[PDB]
Design an enzyme around this catalytic site. Structure first.
Site, PDB file in Angstrom:
ATOM      1  NE  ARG A   1     -11.793 -26.827  -1.069  1.00 26.28           N
ATOM      2  CZ  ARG A   1     -10.684 -27.357  -0.560  1.00 26.28           C
ATOM      3  NH1 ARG A   1     -10.592 -27.565   0.751  1.00 26.28           N
ATOM      4  NH2 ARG A   1      -9.686 -27.723  -1.357  1.00 26.28           N
ATOM      5  CG  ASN A   2     -14.911 -29.002  -3.607  1.00 28.14           C
ATOM      6  OD1 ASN A   2     -15.565 -27.954  -3.645  1.00 28.14           O
ATOM      7  ND2 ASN A   2     -13.638 -29.067  -4.000  1.00 28.14           N
TER       8      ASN A   2
ATOM      9  CG  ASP B   1     -16.961 -27.155  -7.126  1.00 27.42           C
ATOM     10  OD1 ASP B   1     -17.656 -26.491  -7.924  1.00 27.42           O
ATOM     11  OD2 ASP B   1     -16.650 -26.752  -5.983  1.00 27.42           O
TER      12      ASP B   1
ATOM     13  CG  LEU C   1     -25.138 -19.671  -1.932  1.00 27.76           C
ATOM     14  CD1 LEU C   1     -25.007 -20.992  -2.676  1.00 27.76           C
ATOM     15  CD2 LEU C   1     -25.724 -19.887  -0.557  1.00 27.76           C
ATOM     16  N   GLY C   2     -21.395 -17.542  -1.135  1.00 30.14           N
ATOM     17  CA  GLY C   2     -20.072 -17.369  -0.584  1.00 30.14           C
ATOM     18  C   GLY C   2     -19.088 -17.232  -1.720  1.00 30.14           C
ATOM     19  CB  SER C   3     -16.348 -14.954  -2.372  1.00 31.73           C
ATOM     20  OG  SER C   3     -15.197 -14.888  -3.188  1.00 31.73           O
ATOM     21  N   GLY C   4     -15.402 -17.781  -3.617  1.00 33.44           N
ATOM     22  CA  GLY C   4     -14.343 -18.768  -3.721  1.00 33.44           C
ATOM     23  C   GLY C   4     -13.034 -18.152  -4.183  1.00 33.44           C
ATOM     24  CB  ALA C   5      -9.793 -19.796  -4.882  1.00 36.59           C
ATOM     25  CG  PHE C   6      -9.498 -19.262  -9.400  1.00 34.08           C
ATOM     26  CD1 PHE C   6      -9.152 -20.218  -8.449  1.00 34.08           C
ATOM     27  CD2 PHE C   6      -8.495 -18.678 -10.169  1.00 34.08           C
ATOM     28  CE1 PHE C   6      -7.831 -20.588  -8.268  1.00 34.08           C
ATOM     29  CE2 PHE C   6      -7.171 -19.036 -10.001  1.00 34.08           C
ATOM     30  CZ  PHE C   6      -6.836 -19.997  -9.047  1.00 34.08           C
ATOM     31  N   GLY C   7     -13.752 -17.157  -8.095  1.00 36.08           N
ATOM     32  CA  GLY C   7     -15.066 -16.748  -8.533  1.00 36.08           C
ATOM     33  C   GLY C   7     -16.053 -16.579  -7.408  1.00 36.08           C
TER      34      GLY C   7
ATOM     35  CE  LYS D   1     -17.120 -22.721  -8.087  1.00 40.39           C
ATOM     36  NZ  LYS D   1     -16.713 -24.020  -7.502  1.00 40.39           N
TER      37      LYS D   1
HETATM   38  N1  LIG Z   1     -24.755 -26.119  -5.663  1.00 38.60           N
HETATM   39  C1  LIG Z   1     -24.580 -25.481  -4.522  1.00 38.60           C
HETATM   40  N2  LIG Z   1     -25.596 -25.414  -3.603  1.00 38.60           N
HETATM   41  C2  LIG Z   1     -25.405 -24.762  -2.440  1.00 38.60           C
HETATM   42  N3  LIG Z   1     -24.285 -24.123  -2.024  1.00 38.60           N
HETATM   43  C3  LIG Z   1     -23.266 -24.197  -2.972  1.00 38.60           C
HETATM   44  C4  LIG Z   1     -23.320 -24.833  -4.204  1.00 38.60           C
HETATM   45  N4  LIG Z   1     -22.117 -24.707  -4.891  1.00 38.60           N
HETATM   46  C5  LIG Z   1     -21.392 -24.013  -4.061  1.00 38.60           C
HETATM   47  N5  LIG Z   1     -22.021 -23.669  -2.878  1.00 38.60           N
HETATM   48  C6  LIG Z   1     -21.495 -22.895  -1.724  1.00 38.60           C
HETATM   49  O1  LIG Z   1     -20.824 -21.730  -2.189  1.00 38.60           O
HETATM   50  C7  LIG Z   1     -19.639 -21.468  -1.433  1.00 38.60           C
HETATM   51  C8  LIG Z   1     -18.550 -21.220  -2.419  1.00 38.60           C
HETATM   52  O2  LIG Z   1     -18.351 -22.322  -3.322  1.00 38.60           O
HETATM   53  P1  LIG Z   1     -16.926 -22.596  -3.908  1.00 38.60           P
HETATM   54  O3  LIG Z   1     -16.335 -21.328  -4.400  1.00 38.60           O
HETATM   55  O4  LIG Z   1     -17.022 -23.719  -4.859  1.00 38.60           O
HETATM   56  O5  LIG Z   1     -16.297 -23.077  -2.540  1.00 38.60           O
HETATM   57  P2  LIG Z   1     -15.016 -23.704  -1.969  1.00 38.60           P
HETATM   58  O6  LIG Z   1     -14.831 -25.076  -2.524  1.00 38.60           O
HETATM   59  O7  LIG Z   1     -15.023 -23.521  -0.507  1.00 38.60           O
HETATM   60  N6  LIG Z   1     -13.867 -22.702  -2.615  1.00 38.60           N
HETATM   61  P3  LIG Z   1     -12.230 -22.809  -2.702  1.00 38.60           P
HETATM   62  O8  LIG Z   1     -11.802 -23.202  -1.307  1.00 38.60           O
HETATM   63  O9  LIG Z   1     -11.774 -21.442  -3.118  1.00 38.60           O
HETATM   64  O10 LIG Z   1     -12.015 -23.869  -3.739  1.00 38.60           O
HETATM   65  C9  LIG Z   1     -19.391 -22.663  -0.513  1.00 38.60           C
HETATM   66  O11 LIG Z   1     -19.558 -22.146   0.818  1.00 38.60           O
HETATM   67  C10 LIG Z   1     -20.462 -23.657  -0.892  1.00 38.60           C
HETATM   68  O12 LIG Z   1     -21.154 -24.226   0.232  1.00 38.60           O
HETATM   69 MG   LIG Z   2     -17.181 -25.871  -3.611  1.00 40.72          MG
END
Ligand SMILES: Nc1ncnc2c1ncn2[C@@H]1O[C@H](COP(=O)(O)OP(=O)(O)NP(=O)(O)O)[C@@H](O)[C@H]1O
Ligand SMILES: [Mg+2]
Ligand SMILES: Nc1ncnc2c1ncn2[C@@H]1O[C@H](COP(=O)(O)OP(=O)(O)NP(=O)(O)O)[C@@H](O)[C@H]1O
Ligand SMILES: [Mg+2]
Lengths: 288, 281
Positions: free
Chosen positions: A141-142, A155, A18-24, A45
């Protein structure tokens, strides 16, 4: 309680990033319950290894409380998969996060919607507060969009996991959404969640604006004590701006309380035009 | 079978991607009255995009809504106004072209040959009901699950006027020479596209004739040039592809014969391919 499925590596499958985050990394994937012909779309995740300052026993504990949140405005941890990396299984949200949503719709979104989302995020938060839980990382974003008229806070628990609380721990942290006491002393409480909530509403009233654009993370503490705060959103009536400004008070116990906010925003949602001025086989986490 | 919806029984939430003559949205189908919100994919065609009248558009839409095969997406609904909108089920894992790209090497023979059988199946199905896809390509194969792909966009090309000869973007690099030169479309012209599609899958997402203009593809085809043997392919498997790119249309394999030659290989993959190893829905 249990309500936390413990999955084996052969009961879920990571399909698309979907997309990459800070720790995963998050993934569009499939939950495949062993001993039954069913495939459920989910979001996986995966935290990077050695990314959490905790052993598996402690991890799994926290996942139970994560998997024990029952409220329409807070996502529930469905399953976990502990190995050399912890993987979190939650329900898949096809419409993504709310930040990207207000951005894509910089305008064609009415007041009713905005104040609505504020009431909901205030409900999920209050829920947690009652259960005596601290989100520690609330941001637009959360917040995920189940449907345009129902958003859930995602989250819950992740920050405590990545060790936010751990005192001596020296691991990124969402500085621009943190209360002075969180930045300065790493103190997290319900009243520190309110600050993040105030920042979140701000993001929503500005249709996805980045807070303190350009201003370095390192300056945020100094700018806050100097008395600076995010500016009044254009579409915001002074009545609305103040509530946000009240969430950004030095004195933690002075700030509003999610219970009060639910009533304060529930009130405005009955006459939004007055408080906001805008121009204008593949089953399912549910069916299981 | 074709639900006719009011412009109030569905919402376009997020843009999946706006293609050639329109936009695909990720939205919600809210059956009027009922108490359900079904996630769907709404493709909206630009205006004046079609040289046909609505009265006729609906007809094709009934056909599109009649495709009943596990390997061919089915038109759930339609919304005719100044623009036509197509409601289909939402494929969260997207299309297969993007899949082989995001997995240059995590995919083994078993899978690749599998997908070739399935696509052949969906295709055979259409031939049997006397239908022509006209626009088959890796990008037009959506993933329901890693082990089950269904052919998407049946009907669109026709609708956009592929057949209206008089009516003046076209997927040139996937078209049978007879399509490019005379705008002829038949089951045997779908076979050419199918071969180019297997080519895409065997190259994990490569572009066909990358670097050669489209206005030139007509030439290098008569000059005898064709897409190169994929590295992981055995000559046994490559000829099947080459045979799909013959000039004599009726001399190309038939889908019914392809479903068998690929299924036979799918039994011993390692020998034909060589790689390294509210909301219901
Ligand atoms: N349950 C879910 N359903 C759909 N998309 C999700 C879900 N959980 C996470 N995502 C998507 O996955 C991507 C990464 O999630 P995450 O790493 O939690 O993002 P983030 O809060 O932007 N990260 P960060 O800024 O590093 O804390 C985001 O673009 C979210 O939209
Ligand atoms: Mg998130
Ligand atoms: N039913 C569906 N479910 C999920 N995604 C879909 C669906 N239909 C179309 N899409 C996506 O929507 C985007 C646009 O589709 P479309 O307009 O048909 O373009 P395309 O021919 O695939 N792309 P291009 O290569 O640019 O011509 C693509 O990225 C598809 O993956
Ligand atoms: Mg397509």
């Amino acid at each position: 309680q249990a309500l936390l499925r413990i999955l084996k590596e052969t009961e879920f499958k990571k399909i698309k990033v979907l997309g990459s985050g800070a720790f995963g990394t998050v993934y569009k994937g499939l939950w495949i319950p062993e001993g039954e012909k069913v495939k459920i779309p989910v979001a996986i995740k995966e935290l990077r290894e050695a990314t959490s300052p905790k052993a598996n026993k402690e991890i799994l504990d926290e996942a139970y409380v994560m998997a024990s949140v029952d409220n329409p405005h807070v996502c529930r941890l469905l399953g976990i998969c502990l190995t050399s990396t912890v993987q979190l299984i939650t329900q898949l949200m096809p419409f993504g996060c709310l930040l990207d949503y207000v951005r894509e719709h910089k305008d064609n979104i009415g007041s009713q919607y905005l104040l609505n989302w504020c009431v909901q995020i205030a409900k999920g938060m209050n829920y947690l507060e009652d259960r005596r839980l601290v989100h520690r990382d609330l941001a637009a974003r959360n917040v995920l969009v189940k449907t345009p008229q129902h958003v859930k806070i995602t989250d819950f628990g992740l920050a405590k996991l990545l060790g936010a609380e751990e005192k001596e721990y020296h691991a990124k942290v969402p500085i621009k959404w943190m209360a002075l006491e969180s930045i300065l002393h790493r103190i997290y409480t319900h009243q520190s969640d309110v600050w993040s909530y105030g920042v979140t509403v701000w993001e929503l009233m500005t249709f996805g604006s980045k807070p303190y654009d350009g201003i370095p993370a390192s300056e945020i503490s100094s700018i806050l004590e100097k008395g600076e705060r995010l500016p009044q959103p254009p579409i915001c009536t002074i009545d609305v701006y103040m509530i946000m400004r009240k969430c950004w008070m030095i004195d933690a116990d002075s700030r509003p309380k999610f219970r009060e906010l639910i009533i304060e925003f529930s009130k405005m949602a009955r006459d939004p035009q007055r408080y906001l001025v805008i121009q204008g086989d593949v089953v399912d986490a549910d069916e299981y």
